[PDB]
Coordinates of C-alpha atoms and ligand atoms in Angstrom, one line a residue:
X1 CA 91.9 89.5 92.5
X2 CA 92.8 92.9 94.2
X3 CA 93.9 91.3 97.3
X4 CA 97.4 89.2 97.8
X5 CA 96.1 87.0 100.1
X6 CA 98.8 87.3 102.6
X7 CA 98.4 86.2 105.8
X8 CA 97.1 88.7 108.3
X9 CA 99.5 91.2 109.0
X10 CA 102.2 90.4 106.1
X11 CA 102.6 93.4 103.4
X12 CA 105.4 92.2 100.9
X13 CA 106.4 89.8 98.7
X14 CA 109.6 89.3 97.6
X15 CA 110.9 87.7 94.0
X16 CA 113.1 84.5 94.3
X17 CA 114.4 85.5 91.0
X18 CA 115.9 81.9 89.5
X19 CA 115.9 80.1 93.0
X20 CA 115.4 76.4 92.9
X21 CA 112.1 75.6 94.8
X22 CA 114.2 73.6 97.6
X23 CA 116.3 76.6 98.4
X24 CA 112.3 78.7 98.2
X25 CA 111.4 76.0 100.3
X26 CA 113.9 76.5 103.1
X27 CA 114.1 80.1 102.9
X28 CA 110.0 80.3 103.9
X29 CA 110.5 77.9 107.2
X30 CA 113.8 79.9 107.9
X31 CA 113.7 83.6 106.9
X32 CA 110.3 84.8 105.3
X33 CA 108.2 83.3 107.9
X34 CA 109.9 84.6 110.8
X35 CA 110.5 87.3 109.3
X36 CA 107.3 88.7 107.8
X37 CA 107.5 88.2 104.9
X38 CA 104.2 87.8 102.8
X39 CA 105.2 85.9 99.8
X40 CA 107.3 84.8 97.2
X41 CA 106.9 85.5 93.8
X42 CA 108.4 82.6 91.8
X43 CA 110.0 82.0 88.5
X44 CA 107.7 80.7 85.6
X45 CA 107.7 77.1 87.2
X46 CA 106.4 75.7 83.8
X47 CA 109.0 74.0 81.2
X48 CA 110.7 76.2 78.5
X49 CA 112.9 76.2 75.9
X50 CA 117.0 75.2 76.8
X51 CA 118.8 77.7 75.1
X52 CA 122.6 76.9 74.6
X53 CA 123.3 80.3 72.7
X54 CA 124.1 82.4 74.7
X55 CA 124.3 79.9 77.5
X56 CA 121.1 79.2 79.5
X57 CA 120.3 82.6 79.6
X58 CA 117.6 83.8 82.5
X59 CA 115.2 85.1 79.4
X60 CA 115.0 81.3 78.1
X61 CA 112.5 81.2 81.2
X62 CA 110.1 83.4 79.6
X63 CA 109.9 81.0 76.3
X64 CA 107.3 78.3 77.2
X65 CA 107.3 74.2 75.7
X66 CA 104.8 73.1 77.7
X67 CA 103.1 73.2 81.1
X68 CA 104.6 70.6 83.1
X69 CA 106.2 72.2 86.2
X70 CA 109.7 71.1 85.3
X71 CA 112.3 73.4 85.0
X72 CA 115.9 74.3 86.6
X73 CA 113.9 75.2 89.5
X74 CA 112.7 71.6 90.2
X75 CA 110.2 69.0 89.2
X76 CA 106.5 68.6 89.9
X77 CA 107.3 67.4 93.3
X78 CA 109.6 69.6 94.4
X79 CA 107.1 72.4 93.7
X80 CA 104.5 71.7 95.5
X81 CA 106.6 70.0 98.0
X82 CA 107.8 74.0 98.1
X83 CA 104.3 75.5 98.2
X84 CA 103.3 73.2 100.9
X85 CA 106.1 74.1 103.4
X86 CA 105.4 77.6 102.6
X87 CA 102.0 77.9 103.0
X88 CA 102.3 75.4 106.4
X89 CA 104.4 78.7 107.3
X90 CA 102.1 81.8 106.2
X91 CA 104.6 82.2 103.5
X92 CA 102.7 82.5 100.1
X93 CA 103.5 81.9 96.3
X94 CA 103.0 83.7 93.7
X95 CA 103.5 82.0 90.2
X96 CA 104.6 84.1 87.0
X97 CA 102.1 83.1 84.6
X98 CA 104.1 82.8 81.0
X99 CA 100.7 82.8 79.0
X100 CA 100.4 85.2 76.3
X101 CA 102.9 83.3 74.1
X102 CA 105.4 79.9 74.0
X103 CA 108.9 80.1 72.4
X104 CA 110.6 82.0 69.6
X105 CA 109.3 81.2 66.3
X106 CA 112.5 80.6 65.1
X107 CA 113.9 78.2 68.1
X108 CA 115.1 75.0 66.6
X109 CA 112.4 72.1 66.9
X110 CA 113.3 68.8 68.9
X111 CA 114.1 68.6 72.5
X112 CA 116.2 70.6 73.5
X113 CA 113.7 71.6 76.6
X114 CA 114.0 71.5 80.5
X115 CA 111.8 68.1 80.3
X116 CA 112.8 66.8 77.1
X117 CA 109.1 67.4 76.0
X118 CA 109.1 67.9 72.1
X119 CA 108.3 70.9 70.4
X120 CA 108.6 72.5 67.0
X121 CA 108.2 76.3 66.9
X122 CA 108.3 76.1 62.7
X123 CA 105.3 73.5 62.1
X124 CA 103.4 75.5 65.4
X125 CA 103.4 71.9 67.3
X126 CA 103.7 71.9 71.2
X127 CA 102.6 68.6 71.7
X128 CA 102.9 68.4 75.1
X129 CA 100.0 70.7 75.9
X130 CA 99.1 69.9 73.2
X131 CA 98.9 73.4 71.0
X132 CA 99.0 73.5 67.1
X133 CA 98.9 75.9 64.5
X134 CA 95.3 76.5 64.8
X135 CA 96.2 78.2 68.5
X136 CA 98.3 80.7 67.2
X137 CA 97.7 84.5 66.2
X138 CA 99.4 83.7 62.4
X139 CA 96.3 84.7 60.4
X140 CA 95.3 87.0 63.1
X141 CA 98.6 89.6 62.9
X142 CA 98.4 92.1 60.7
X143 CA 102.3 93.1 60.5
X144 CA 104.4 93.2 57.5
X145 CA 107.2 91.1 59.9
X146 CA 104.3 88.9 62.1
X147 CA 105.8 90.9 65.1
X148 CA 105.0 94.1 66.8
X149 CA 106.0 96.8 64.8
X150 CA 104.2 99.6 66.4
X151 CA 102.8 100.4 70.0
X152 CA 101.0 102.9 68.9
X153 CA 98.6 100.8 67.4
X154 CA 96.9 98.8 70.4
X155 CA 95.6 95.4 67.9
X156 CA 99.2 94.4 66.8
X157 CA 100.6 94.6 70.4
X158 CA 98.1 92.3 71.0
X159 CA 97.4 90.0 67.9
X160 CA 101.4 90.0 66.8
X161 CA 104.5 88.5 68.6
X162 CA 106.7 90.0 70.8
X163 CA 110.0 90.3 69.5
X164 CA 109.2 86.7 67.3
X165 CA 107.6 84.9 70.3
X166 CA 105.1 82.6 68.9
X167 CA 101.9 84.2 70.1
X168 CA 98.5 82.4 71.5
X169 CA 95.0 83.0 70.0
X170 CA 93.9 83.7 73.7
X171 CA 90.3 84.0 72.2
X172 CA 90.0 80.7 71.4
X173 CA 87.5 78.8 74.3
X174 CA 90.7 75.8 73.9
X175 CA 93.4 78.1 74.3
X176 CA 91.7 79.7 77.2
X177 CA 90.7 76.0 78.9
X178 CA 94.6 74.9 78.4
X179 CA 96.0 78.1 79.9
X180 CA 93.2 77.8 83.0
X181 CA 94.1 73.9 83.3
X182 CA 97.6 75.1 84.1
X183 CA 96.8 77.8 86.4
X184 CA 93.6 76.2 88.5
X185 CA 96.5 73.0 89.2
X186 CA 98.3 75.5 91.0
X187 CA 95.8 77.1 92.5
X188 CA 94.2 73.7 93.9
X189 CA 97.8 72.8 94.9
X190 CA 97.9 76.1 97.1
X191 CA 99.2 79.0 95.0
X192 CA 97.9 82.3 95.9
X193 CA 98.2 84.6 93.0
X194 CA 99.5 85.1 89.6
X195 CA 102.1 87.2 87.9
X196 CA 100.2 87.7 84.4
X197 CA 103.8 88.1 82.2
X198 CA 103.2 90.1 79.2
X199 CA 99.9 91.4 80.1
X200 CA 100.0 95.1 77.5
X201 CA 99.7 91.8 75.0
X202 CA 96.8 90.5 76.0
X203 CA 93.4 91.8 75.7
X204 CA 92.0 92.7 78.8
X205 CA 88.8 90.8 78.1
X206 CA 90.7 87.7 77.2
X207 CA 92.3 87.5 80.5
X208 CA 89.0 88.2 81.7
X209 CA 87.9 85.3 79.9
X210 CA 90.5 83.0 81.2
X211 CA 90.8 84.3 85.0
X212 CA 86.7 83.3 84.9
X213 CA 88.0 80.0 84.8
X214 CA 89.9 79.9 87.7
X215 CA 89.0 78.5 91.0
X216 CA 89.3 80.0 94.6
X217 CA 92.0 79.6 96.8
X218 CA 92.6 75.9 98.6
X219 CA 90.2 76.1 101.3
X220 CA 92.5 74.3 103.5
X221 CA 94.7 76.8 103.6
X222 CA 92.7 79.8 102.6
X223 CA 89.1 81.3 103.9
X224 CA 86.7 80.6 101.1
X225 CA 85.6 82.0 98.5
X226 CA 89.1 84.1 98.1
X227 CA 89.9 84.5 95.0
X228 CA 93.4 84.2 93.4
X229 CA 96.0 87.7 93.8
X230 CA 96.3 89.0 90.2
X231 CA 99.2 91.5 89.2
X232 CA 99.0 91.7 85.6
X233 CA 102.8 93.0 83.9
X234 CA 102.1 96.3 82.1
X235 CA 104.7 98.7 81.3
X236 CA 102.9 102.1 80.6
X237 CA 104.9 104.8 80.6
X238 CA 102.5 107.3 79.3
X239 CA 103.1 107.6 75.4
X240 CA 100.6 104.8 74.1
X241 CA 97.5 103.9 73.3
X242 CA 97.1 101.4 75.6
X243 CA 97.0 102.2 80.0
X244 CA 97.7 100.1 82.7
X245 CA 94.2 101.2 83.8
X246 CA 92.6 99.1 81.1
X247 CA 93.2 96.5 82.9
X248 CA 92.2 97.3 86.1
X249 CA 89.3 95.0 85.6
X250 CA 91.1 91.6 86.0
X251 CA 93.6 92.9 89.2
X252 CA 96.4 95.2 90.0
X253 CA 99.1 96.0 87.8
X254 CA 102.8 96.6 87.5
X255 CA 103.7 100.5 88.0
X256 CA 106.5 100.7 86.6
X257 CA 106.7 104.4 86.4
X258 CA 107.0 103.8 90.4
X259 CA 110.7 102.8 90.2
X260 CA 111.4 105.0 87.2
X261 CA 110.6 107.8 89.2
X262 CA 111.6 107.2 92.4
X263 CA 115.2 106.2 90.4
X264 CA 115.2 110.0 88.9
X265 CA 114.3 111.5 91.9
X266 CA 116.8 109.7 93.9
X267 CA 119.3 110.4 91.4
X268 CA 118.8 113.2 91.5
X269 CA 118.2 113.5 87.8
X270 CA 116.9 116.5 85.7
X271 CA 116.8 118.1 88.9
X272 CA 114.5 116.6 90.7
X273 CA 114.7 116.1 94.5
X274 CA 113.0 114.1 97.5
X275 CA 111.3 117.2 98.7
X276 CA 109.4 116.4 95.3
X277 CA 107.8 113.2 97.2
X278 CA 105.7 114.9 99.3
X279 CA 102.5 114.1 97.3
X280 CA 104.0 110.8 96.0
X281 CA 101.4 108.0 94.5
X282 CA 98.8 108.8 92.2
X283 CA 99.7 112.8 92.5
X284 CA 102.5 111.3 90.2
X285 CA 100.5 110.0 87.8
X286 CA 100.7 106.6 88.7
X287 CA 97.0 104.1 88.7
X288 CA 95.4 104.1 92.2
X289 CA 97.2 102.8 95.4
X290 CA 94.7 99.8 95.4
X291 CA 95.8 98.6 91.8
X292 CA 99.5 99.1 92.1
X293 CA 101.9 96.5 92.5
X294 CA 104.8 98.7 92.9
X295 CA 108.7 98.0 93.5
X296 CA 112.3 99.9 92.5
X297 CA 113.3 97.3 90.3
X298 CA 112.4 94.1 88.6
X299 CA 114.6 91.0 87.1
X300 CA 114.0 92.7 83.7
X301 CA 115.1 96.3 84.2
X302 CA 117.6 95.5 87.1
X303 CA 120.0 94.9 83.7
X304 CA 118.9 97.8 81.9
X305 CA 117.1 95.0 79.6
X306 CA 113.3 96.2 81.4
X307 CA 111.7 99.8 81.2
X308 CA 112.6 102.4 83.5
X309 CA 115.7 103.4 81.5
X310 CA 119.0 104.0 83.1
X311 CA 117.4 105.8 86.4
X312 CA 116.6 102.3 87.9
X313 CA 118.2 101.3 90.7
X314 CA 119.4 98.0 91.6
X315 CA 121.6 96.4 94.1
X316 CA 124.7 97.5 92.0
X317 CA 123.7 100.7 93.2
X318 CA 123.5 99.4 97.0
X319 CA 123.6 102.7 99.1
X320 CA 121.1 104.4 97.5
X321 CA 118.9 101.4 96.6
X322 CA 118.2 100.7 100.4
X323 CA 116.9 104.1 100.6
X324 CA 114.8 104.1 97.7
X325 CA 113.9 100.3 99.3
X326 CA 113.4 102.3 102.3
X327 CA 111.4 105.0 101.1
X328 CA 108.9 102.9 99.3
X329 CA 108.6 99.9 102.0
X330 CA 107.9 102.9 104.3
X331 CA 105.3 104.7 102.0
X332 CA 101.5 103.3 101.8
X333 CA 101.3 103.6 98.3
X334 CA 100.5 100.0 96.5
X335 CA 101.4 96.5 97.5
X336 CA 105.6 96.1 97.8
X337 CA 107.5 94.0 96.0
X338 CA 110.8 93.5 97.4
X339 CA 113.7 92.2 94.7
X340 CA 116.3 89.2 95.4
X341 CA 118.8 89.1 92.7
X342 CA 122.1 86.9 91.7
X343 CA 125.2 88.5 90.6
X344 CA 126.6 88.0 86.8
X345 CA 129.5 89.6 85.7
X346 CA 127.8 93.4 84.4
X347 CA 130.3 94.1 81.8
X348 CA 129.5 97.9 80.3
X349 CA 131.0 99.0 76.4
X350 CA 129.7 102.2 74.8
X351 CA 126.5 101.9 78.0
X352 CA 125.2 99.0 77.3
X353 CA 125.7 95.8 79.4
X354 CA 127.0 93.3 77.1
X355 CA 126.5 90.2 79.7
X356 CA 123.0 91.0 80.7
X357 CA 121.7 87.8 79.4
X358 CA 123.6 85.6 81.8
X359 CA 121.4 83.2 83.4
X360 CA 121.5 82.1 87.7
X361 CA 124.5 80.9 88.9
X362 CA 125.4 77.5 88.0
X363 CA 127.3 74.6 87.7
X364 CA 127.0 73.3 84.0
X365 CA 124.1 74.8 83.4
X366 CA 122.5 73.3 86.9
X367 CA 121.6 76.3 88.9
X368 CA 123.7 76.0 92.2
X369 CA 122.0 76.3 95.5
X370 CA 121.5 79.2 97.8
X371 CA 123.8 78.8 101.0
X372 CA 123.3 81.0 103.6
X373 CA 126.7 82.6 105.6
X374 CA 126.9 83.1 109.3
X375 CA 126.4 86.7 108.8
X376 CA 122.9 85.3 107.2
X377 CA 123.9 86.6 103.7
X378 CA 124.4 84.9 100.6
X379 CA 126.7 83.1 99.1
X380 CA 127.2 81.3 95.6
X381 CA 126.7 84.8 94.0
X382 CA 123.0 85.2 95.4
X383 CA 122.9 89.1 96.3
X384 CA 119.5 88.1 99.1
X385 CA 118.7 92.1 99.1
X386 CA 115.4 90.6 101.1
X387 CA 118.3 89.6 103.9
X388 CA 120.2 92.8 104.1
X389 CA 119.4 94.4 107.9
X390 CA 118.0 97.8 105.7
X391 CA 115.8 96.1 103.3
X392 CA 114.3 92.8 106.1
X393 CA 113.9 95.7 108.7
X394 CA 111.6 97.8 106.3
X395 CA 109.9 94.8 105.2
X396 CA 109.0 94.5 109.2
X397 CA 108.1 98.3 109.4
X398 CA 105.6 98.1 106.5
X399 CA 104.0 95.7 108.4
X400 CA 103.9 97.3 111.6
X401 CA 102.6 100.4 110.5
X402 CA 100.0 98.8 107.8
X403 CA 97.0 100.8 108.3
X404 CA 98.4 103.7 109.3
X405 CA 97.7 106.9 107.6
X406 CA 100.8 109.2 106.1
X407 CA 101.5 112.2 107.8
X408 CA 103.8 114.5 109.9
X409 CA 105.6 115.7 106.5
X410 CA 108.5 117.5 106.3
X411 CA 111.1 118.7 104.1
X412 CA 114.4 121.2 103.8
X413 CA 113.2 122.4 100.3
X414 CA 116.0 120.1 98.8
X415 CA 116.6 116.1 99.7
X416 CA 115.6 116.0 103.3
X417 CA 112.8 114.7 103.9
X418 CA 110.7 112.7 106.9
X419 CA 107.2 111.4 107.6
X420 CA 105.2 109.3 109.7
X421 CA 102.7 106.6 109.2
X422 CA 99.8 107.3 112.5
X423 CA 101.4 107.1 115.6
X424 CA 103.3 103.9 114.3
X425 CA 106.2 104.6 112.5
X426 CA 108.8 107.7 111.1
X427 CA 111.4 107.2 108.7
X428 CA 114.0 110.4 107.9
X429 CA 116.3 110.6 105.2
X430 CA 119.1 112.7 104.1
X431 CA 120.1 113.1 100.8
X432 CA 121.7 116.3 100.0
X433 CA 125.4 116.5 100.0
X434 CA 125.5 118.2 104.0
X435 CA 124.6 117.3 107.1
X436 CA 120.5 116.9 108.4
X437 CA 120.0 117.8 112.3
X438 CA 117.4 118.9 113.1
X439 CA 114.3 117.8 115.6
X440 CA 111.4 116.9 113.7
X441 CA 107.7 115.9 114.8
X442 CA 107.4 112.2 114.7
X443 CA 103.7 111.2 116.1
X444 CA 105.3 108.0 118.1
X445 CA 104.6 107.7 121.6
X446 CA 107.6 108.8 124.1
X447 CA 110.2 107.0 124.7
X448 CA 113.1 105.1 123.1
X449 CA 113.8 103.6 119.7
X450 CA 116.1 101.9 118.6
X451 CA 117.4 102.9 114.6
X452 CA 116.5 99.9 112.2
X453 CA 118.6 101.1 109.6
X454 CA 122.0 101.3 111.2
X455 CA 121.3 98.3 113.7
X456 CA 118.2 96.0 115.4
X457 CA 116.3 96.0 118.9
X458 CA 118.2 92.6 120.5
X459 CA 117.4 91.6 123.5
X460 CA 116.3 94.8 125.2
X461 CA 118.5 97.2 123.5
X462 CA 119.5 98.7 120.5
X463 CA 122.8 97.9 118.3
X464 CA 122.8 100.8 116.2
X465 CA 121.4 104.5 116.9
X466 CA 118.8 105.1 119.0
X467 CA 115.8 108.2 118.8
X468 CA 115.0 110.0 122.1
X469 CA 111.0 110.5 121.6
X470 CA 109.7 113.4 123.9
X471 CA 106.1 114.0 125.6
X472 CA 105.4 115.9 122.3
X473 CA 106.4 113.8 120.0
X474 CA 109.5 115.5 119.2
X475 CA 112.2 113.7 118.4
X476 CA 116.3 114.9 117.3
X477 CA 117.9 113.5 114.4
X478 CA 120.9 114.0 112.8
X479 CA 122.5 112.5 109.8
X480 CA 126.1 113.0 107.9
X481 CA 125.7 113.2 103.9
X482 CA 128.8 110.9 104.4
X483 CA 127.0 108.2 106.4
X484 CA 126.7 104.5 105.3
X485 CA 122.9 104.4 105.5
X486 CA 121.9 108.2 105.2
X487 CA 118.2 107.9 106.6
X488 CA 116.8 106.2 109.8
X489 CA 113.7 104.2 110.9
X490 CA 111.7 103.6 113.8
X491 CA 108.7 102.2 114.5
X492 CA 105.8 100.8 117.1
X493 CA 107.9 97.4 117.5
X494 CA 111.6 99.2 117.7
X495 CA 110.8 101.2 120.6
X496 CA 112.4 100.1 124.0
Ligands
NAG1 C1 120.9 96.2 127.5 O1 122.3 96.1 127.3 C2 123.1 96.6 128.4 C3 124.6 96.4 128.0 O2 124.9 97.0 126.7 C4 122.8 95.9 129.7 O3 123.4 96.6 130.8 C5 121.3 95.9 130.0 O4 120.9 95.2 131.2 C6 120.5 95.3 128.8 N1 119.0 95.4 129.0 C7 118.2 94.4 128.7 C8 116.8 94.6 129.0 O5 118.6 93.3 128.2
CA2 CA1 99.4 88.4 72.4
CL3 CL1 107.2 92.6 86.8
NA4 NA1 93.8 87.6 104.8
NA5 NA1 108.0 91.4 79.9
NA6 NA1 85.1 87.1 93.5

């Protein structure tokens, strides 16, 4: 469950947040596999709930109806259609697995779904599965309200619904069998691993109970006996009851303190500083390397609407979110997720972001398609952080350097900072308000190597700056407070 499942040599995965599974499709033969890229962590490809008010917000996603794969995404077909051109690729897919609850209790009964499947949240009937009032938690909750009132008490976050979300009696054998039906289909159908959404409200031997269920890997396109990647969505911050580490059992989990810290630190906040990264990883008190499924932000906290608070960084924040990108991609702490966002129109009164519910872009309500510039960006309002030149190119050094240990620290005492990973890679990065040069021991092999920051290695040569590597190891660097990209990166596969 530990392992991605990635083929050999691929260390990321990045999230196709909202992307229709054509556009996934495309972007595995054309970018990710090419590229390097690992996976792709798609959204919840199982039918939910059409919300109208607001307007098909991106949260209506999280708000199951059923489990046929049809959504805005695509249908049936056009999934696996999408799994099968990625994994013919090396490219693999990730599903988030919406299974700790179905819509709000208080959603309006009928049809008003991305299938048209009936459902009534008041009478408990989601006939399409089909689930009934016997499969909910109703009896089961102890709260005043029937939702979570209070994390400090580890049953109700588990037995009551989030913020009203009808929740499932997850110890119920039927319950269990439905939710494994839905998730070994995938699997058999060539999914490699599981997004387990909501995960701090499910008991960790329920999910147990369930991921016993599920099969192994297609052994067409996967060695047997491997067993499906499990990431499990906790947000533990520190202050409860319940720790990520409970659920270490089942697979990895979110760190979100990762990103929260990493934000501060890079932001400088509370006077923190890069220097401060030296022992980054579990010195932070964050779970073990081998159980973290780390990244600097996710679709929920990107719009403040996650956990992380107001230190996240997103791509609003484009400067110093490729070096946080940077900084993480380059350090082997936990399995990288890489986020690919859409723009909506952040609209901020007295802090808070009034529009952050604003679903994909679309064109009455259908979700438009990703077209990709000459410049290979995005257009349509796709951000495609996964294609900017800082983000792709650290993507590749992760990859190059995988194995490698960390080493050949160093630090001003303030925000410059530099390391290696073996004799493979050295990123440096400057983020104090002066100037950094200074030569710094970078354990590559002489020679010359090209800057994957500020440019590529085309062709024989470098179009951005290049690092002199002596006979030592030794290597000058200099870089301007005021520059675009303020660190720089080499690696085994940059050099000329
Ligand atoms: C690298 O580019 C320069 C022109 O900028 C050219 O003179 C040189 O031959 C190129 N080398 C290779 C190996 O392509
Ligand atoms: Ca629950
Ligand atoms: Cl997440
Ligand atoms: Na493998
Ligand atoms: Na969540
Ligand atoms: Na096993």
């Amino acid at each position: 469950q530990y392992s991605p499942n990635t083929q050999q040599g691929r260390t990321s995965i990045v999230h196709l947040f909202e992307w229709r599974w054509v556009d996934i499709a495309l972007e595995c033969e054309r970018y990710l596999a090419p590229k390097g890229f690992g996976g792709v962590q798609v959204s919840p490809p199982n039918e939910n709930v059409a919300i109208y008010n607001p307007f098909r917000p991106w949260w209506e996603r999280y708000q199951p109806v059923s489990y046929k794969l049809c959504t805005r995404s695509g249908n049936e077909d056009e999934f696996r259609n999408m799994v099968t051109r990625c994994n013919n690729v090396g490219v693999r897919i990730y599903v988030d697995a919406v299974i700790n609850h179905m819509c709000g209790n208080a959603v309006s009964a009928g049809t008003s779904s991305t299938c048209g499947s009936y459902f009534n949240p008041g009478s408990r009937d989601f006939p399409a599965v089909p689930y009934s009032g016997w499969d909910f938690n109703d009896g089961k909750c102890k709260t005043g309200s029937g939702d979570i009132e209070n994390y400090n008490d580890a049953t109700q976050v588990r037995d009551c619904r989030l913020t009203g979300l009808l929740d499932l009696a997850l110890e119920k054998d039927y319950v269990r069998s439905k939710i494994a039906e839905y998730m070994n289909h995938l699997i058999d159908i060539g999914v490699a691993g599981f997004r387990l959404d909501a995960s701090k409200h499910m008991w960790p031997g329920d999910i147990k109970a369930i991921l016993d269920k599920l099969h192994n890997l297609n052994s067409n396109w996967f060695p047997a006996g491997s067993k499906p990647f499990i990431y499990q969505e906790v947000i533990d911050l520190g202050g409860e009851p319940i720790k990520s580490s409970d659920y270490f059992g089942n697979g990895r989990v979110t760190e979100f303190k990762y990103g929260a810290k990493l934000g501060t630190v890079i932001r400088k906040w509370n006077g923190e500083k890069m220097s401060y990264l030296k022992n980054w990883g579990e010195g932070w008190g964050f779970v073990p390397s081998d159980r973290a499924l780390v990244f600097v932000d996710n679709h929920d906290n990107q719009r403040g609407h996650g956990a992380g608070g107001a230190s996240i960084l997103t791509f609003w924040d484009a400067r110093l979110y490729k070096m946080a990108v940077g900084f993480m991609l380059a350090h082997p702490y936990g399995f990288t997720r890489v986020m690919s966002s859409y723009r909506w129109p952040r609209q901020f009164q007295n802090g808070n972001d009034v529009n952050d519910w604003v679903g994909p872009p679309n064109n009455n309500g259908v979700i438009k398609e990703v077209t990709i510039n000459p410049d290979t960006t995005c257009g349509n309002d796709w951000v495609c952080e996964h294609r900017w030149r800082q983000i792709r190119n650290m993507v590749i050094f992760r990859n190059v350097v995988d194995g490698q240990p960390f080493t050949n620290w160093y630090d001003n005492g303030s925000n410059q900072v530099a390391f290696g990973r073996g004799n493979r890679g050295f990123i440096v990065f400057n983020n104090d308000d002066w100037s950094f040069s200074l030569t710094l021991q970078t354990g590559l092999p002489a020679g010359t190597y090209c800057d994957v920051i500020s440019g590529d290695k085309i062709n024989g040569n470098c179009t951005g700056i290049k690092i002199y590597v002596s006979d030592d190891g030794k290597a000058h660097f200099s870089i301007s407070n005021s520059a675009e990209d303020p660190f720089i990166a080499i690696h085994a596969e940059s050099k000329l």
